[PDB]
Subunit: 334 residues, 4 copies
């Protein structure tokens, strides 16, 4: 995109926007336009360089860029929510959560690499429909994964498979030991994004906040793998369910996108004479009531528990959530 | 009772048997279901549901399912191109020179084959899939990767819930249908164009017609060959359509080609031919496409059903001039 | 006929815990899974009940059996045949008499028949360490088990093979879910947590007035079915010594081959797979003590006292092997 | 790290057997027993060392052995004919044919590697039944490959797929251009092994013989890829059909195996109520007539043409073929 070794006017504007990668509330949609619809590539690249992950894991730059573009190319541009913009956002969000004071120096570079790589592939090749819809139509995807976390298993499978395309193996220089460890952590994290796992994921997290233990600096202390992976699973899970905690201006865009996607599934289900899934009926919808419900039963209980784990780090995020809830509350038409 | 969108749609569907159907218009009016609507319309028109005892619901379900597997984000190789090739083949099947030459099964094969010939097309060429070591290319050994895939997906989609539209055909019919469909779709791979055309010419030079001018086809070989070229012509019929339609196709294919070029540029790959938006020649390209591929093909087909395709050759030669006089200097 | 007079005679034990499966494999021409599944389907009148054409059932069974590897010493068609017949008997246990619908009975038996289809003779960890296509497809999670399910269902799609063609949509979805639930439960890594939940059920155990076990909701009925097939899969040590020793030789042969493969490859040799540092005897006793017995003891406490003659046979076979531990 | 790729205390007896690696009639069955059923791994290792392919293409020793073991592991031990022994034999036979005087210095190292690799993977994961059988039972395999060269397309896919297992990428150090060339040549060679392409192949070979050209040296002239790949295809095709041209003792063993595999398909076809395939009915078998017919209508016509192409290099191969043909003839019950 440059000319004579100097940034283009667009690149410069993009570079200036990217300066907020370490802040909750990055203008992720602005970055998607500026990057020519390459939010996931540019943001992952910026984060890998910010964290010096290329040197640490000897990842050639071109291989990194080639894989990222290939990964992004596999997110469907025609899907309203579960696309490359959602992935870029979950990546950036995870990146911010990883740098929380309460977790400073808690994770190794490899665990950090896993949290981020997992965030980047967690919804790749999402068809824009739920597991249940895939299950009810006897799709081969459902047949292949025995109707269990179909999409999630698929996202993982594809994320790894793309490492094999020409000059795409960003892990070519890791030892078998590192790769097996990285791989197990990424799998554990992504499978934990299947909402059907939510309740139990939160139950275990609350419990961890009970036996919780720290140091004289308030920094968390995680004994073994079981505790460290649990924090990472919930971290990415929070990032995936962070739309409601973002400045309303961003949140509203996420709401329109998820509803647009749900409504498309409802239309397809109606055409096919299937029962219209919950919240996927544009003729009997309550965008405001549903967002309030989403917040009261899932998002608030999750972030509240997280804010507790890293208290008081996630206070502003928690305040924003509660504020956005009241805003949606006051919007319900009587 | 009316419902406007319905009157305007059903009205447009009235041209289903005519070369020049306003397919883009039908796509809009049907809420983006041109393949479902047109296939179904055509299936009724030819009385196909009754002949092969295809339950309506199963057909509609399979059609929407198939249509759902064409990519909405692909400018050219999407559900609209599929619908067009289907309808274009439906017209070519009714040409006088072939009157009553094909059985109902063979008619079903040419149409189903047209419906799935490009399903799940990613918007990029075989060579791009090969050069990047895509899972698809490795699976098909770099040979007609996409075409093999289209077949595989088209058939596979029959196994989804209430999607087996051939559930009442016999093992004999299913076997015969499968083989014909496979032969037809694999023939759409452009790398096989030159040979297909040559082999077609040799057939015209043995054109064993009747007293009415109706072609004669004995063995499966002659038969399948006409079906392969028929579908091949349908697939390559954009230029022979009313200028207003042809122009939309041209804009669509270029959008897709340029998108591939941008992809290839991003990856540092050599930009494929006619895929560089910075070094384009839309007008010059189209003219060349017509002279070296489309016209040579259509002149041969019209030479097999003479004079059934005169208006087709005329519209072609006309658009050929329109784009030509559009060449800057 | 000179053969079936012997076979059919041997097949008269289908309902007894100790059938001579090996001899049956001989007499049937290495078709124990096809034969035994056939008998059991007639015995329970499953063909007429679900309107399964005879030709279709047999074609599928043969197709299914053909996908069990003849070169694998343990995880072959004989293990499959045996787990089927064993699940068959466990379903007739008094404490469960008339507790399961025919669909459920179908699911349990079908799940048993396909539970190990296309087993390569090596463990999930081996497929994982080698970056095999199977492990990459299933994200190193219950790799073999997911595969067994996929192939089992997939083979229904072959010529004249859909034995569930005449089931209603509801029956198909129900069966499908249950078969998956069962087979995924046979992954030994799920053992500990599957037994813990079985015991928690043994405590709050409740029966009907007729005595027969009272199975409330789906969660309770599937969990009982999961553990049942799991018991059938780990039944070898509870059978008569003669049979049991044949299984030990077979499992050890398969394990040693895997060990030899890991050695040629400079891979760490898996536990009990090193033929140069073997302990066939101590291992069977340890297998019986820390896994098999605890499982069959919790099952005894569930269908008490139905699983009595079996549990004693287990405790005896242990003594025998222990008396063979060198030192 | 052992001497012949695998460990064996019979190493001395194995070494003596492997001395004939460059000779037609190597005791392949004997080598299989001595290598612990690793004839493919041992023979490929020996050939790569002799041709110096590891050095030329920077193939790490351990990567090659791991791949060969993996590849050999995917030939089925329960299949009597299409197993690792047949693959080892075809590899070795192709190796001898590549060394024929009439072809000296004609092929590049890359083309030699392609011919040998293609021979090694040409029948991998063979089920022991024909393409026709897989097509008539609606096998998943036939569906994936639209009933066209089902087995052959699969042999190629598996052979290439296995390069992705841990430490199995023997082509990791080849440039992109080399990898594409090799891949195209291997695909072209293996697909030509489908017997349904036999007549076109032969007819084409005869044509080339008709206008055959030799250089200033006594070697064949091949300009374009088209003439080059054609010779390689016929060469491997000849190796695949070389059983009848080997010392009778070896030939008869091959005959028993193929018949055993054919009858197996025969029994399976009758169990399922299928029409038994030709030469698969153990109840109506004429093993001797069949071998004679096989030699008269397929093998001899092919080797006769190959002999002319490399005249007089394969004169003894042809002489043995005729001696063996008479042996089977005098074995025909009357
Ligand atoms: C901010 O919007 C949302 C953002 C993200 C999600 C996740 C994506 N898919 C899910 O099931 C949860 C749901 C949302 O809203 C849903 C809750 C109520 C209606 C839709
Ligand atoms: C309407 O034009 C076109 C319409 C359709 C096609 C087919 C789609 N892919 C192919 O390879 C042929 C090409 C066209 O023109 C191309 C040739 C020159 C420029 C683009
Ligand atoms: C009859 O023996 C056995 C029978 C069955 C099994 C199951 C099959 N695969 C498993 O992982 C468990 C293990 C046996 O013995 C093993 C335990 C110690 C050595 C081998
Ligand atoms: C050693 O003989 C044979 C050796 C090799 C083959 C090839 C392997 N598979 C084929 O289809 C051909 C066939 C043989 O003989 C067959 C032809 C007549 C009877 C069997
Ligand atoms: Zn998701
Ligand atoms: Zn997500
Ligand atoms: Zn196409
Ligand atoms: Zn097309
Ligand atoms: Zn198992
Ligand atoms: Zn088992
Ligand atoms: Zn072959
Ligand atoms: Zn072969």
């Amino acid at each position: 995109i440059p000319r004579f070794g100097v940034k283009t006017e667009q690149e410069d504007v993009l570079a200036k926007e990217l300066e907020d990668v370490n802040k909750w509330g990055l203008h992720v949609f602005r970055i998607a336009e500026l990057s020519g619809n390459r939010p996931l590539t540019v943001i992952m690249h910026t984060i890998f360089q910010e964290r010096d992950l290329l040197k640490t894991f000897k990842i050639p730059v071109d291989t990194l860029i080639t894989y990222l573009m290939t990964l992004e190319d596999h997110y469907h541009a025609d899907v309203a929510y579960h696309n490359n913009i959602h992935a870029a956002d979950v990546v950036q969000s995870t990146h911010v959560l990883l740098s929380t004071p309460a977790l400073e120096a808690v994770f190794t570079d490899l665990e950090i690499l896993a949290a981020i790589f997992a965030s980047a592939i967690h919804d790749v090749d999402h068809p824009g429909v739920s597991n249940q819809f895939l299950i009810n139509t006897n799709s081969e995807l459902a047949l292949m994964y025995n109707d269990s976390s179909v999409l999630e298993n698929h996202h993982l499978a594809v994320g790894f498979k793309l490492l094999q395309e020409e000059n795409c193996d960003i892990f070519q220089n890791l030892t078998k030991k590192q790769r097996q460890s990285l791989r197990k952590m990424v799998i554990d994290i992504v499978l934990a994004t299947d909402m059907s796992k939510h309740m139990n994921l939160l139950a275990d997290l609350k419990t961890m906040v009970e036996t919780k233990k720290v140091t004289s600096s308030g920094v968390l202390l995680l004994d073994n793998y079981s505790d460290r992976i649990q924090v990472l699973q919930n971290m990415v899970h929070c990032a995936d369910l962070s739309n409601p905690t973002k400045p309303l201006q961003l949140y509203r865009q996420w709401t329109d996108r998820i509803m647009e996607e749900f409504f498309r599934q409802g239309d397809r289900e109606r055409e096919r004479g299937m029962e219209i899934s919950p919240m996927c009926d544009k003729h009997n919808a309550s965008v405001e009531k549903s967002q309030v419900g989403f917040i009261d039963y899932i998002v608030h209980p999750l972030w509240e528990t997280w804010a507790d784990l890293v208290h008081p780090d996630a206070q502003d995020i928690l305040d924003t959530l509660e504020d956005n809830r009241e805003w949606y509350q006051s919007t319900i038409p009587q």
